[PDB]
């Protein structure tokens with residue numbers, strides 16, 4: 438089969454896919470990109486349809502099996518290699534890029550392809566002088582010139598690695614990045630399970646970031662790392678998150694935290710964070726969230742936002758209810774958003790959870 442990765446075994450193990458895995462990141466489950474479109478792998482758009490089922494159909498078609506929206510790294514590489522072939526075809530039809538591309542060795546061609554993936558042909562073609570320097574093998578001068586650009590300002594850590602690749606014609610920047618992340622991960626990993634960071638390592642990570650593990654900032658970090666569960670931090674989560682956040686050190690991650698916090702002010706992002714909290718907090722083996730844990734996280738995330746939070750605590754402390762289902766968790770935010778200061782506009786026919794109907798009856802008097 439034409440796309441089999443065995444057909445590439447004569448290449449080096451480092452390649453354009455591994456390069457973009459470091460610079461852009463790899464996602465193995467369907468997700469919505471910036472513009473809200475279903476995507477997988479390394480930036481592989483599946484469809485503009487709002488239908489997840491449509492996206493899954495395209496994915497199942499491309500992979501040759503029932504993926505249910507989840508793929509392996511090798512499958513992502515096959516999709517990516519198709520995308521690279523198309524990008525190279527475009528480069529080769531581009532009168533300004535073709536001569537540069539043709540002149541470069543394989544490693545530096547990967548650096549040029551990386552640029553095209555990030556900014557498109559027009560963007561890359563605008564680097565007239567730097568492209569000429571590359572064609573003339575004036576590597577140090579090209580590197581100096583590229584570092585002066587807006588590209589460098591937009592993504593300095595990625596751009597520095599791509600520039601190093603042009604300067605040296607080696608994969609050194611990527612080997613170094615990988616080692617730095619491995620060595621940092623190793624500071625936190627569970628000594629009995631190299632696949633995750635346990636409670637002790639999470640505490641150490643918080644200590645290194647000078648944050649209280651019970652702070653909202655630490656939950657915000659977990660949200661940005663798309664962490665599955667509060668009780669562990671997987672190697673994959675750690676690597677994907679450091680990649681997505683453009684950080685290869687604790688100092689860089691620390692500097693990123695206020696930027697993460699600011700995102701909560703953008704449209705829909707607090708809701709996304711609030712909904713994330715339920716799955717993160719709950720025991721993986723349970724469908725619902727134990728009431729006591731729900732109360733603790735509600736107090737962390739809603740204090741100062743939900744004007745009836747103290748009354749909600751009073752109500753629940755009387756309650757028996759063992760646990761909270763996802764829909765009830767989600768709808769409390771909607772309730773908080775719509776409710777009048779005196780609860781006078783509650784719609785009992787709005788199909789709110791019974792828990793919220795009961796709360797309104799309890800609270801109105803107070």
Ligand SMILES: C[C@@H](O)O[C@H]1CN(Cc2ccccc2)CC[C@@H]1NC(=O)Nc1cccc(C(F)(F)F)c1
Nearest residue numbers: 639640650651655658659662664667669670733734
């Ligand atoms: C594991 C221990 O050191 O700290 C915890 C105490 N918890 C305190 C708390 C309980 C209930 C409500 C609010 C706060 C919050 C979760 C917190 N655990 C936690 O942050 N886990 C975590 C899991 C994956 C990823 C990350 C993160 F990326 F580092 F943020 C953290």
